[PDB]
């Protein structure tokens, strides 16, 4: 069996949570 398109889009949408959490931690550590 192989992954589906919806399984790849679930990954893409779910990685927006670490993606913006990382930006929040980067700006909280104050460059």
- Binding residues (CB under 6 A) for ligand CLA: these are 11-12, 15
Q: How far is the CB of 2 from ligand LHG (least distance, A)?
A: 25
Token representation of residue 1:
């069996």
**Binding site residues, other proteins, CB under 8 A:** 1-5, 7-11, 14-15, 17-18, 21-22, 24-26, 28-31
Name residue, tokens 């550590």. 29
Q: Is the dihedral of CA 19, 22, 27, 31 positive or negative?
A: negative
Q: How far is the CB of 20 from ligand LHG (least distance, A)?
A: 5
Instruction: Count helices and strands (H / E) in the chain.
Output: 2, 0
Minimal CB distance to ligand CLA: which residue? 15
């Amino acid at each position: 069996m192989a992954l589906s398109d919806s399984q790849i889009f679930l990954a893409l949408a779910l990685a927006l949570i670490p993606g913006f959490l990382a930006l929040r931690l980067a700006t909280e550590l104050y460059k």
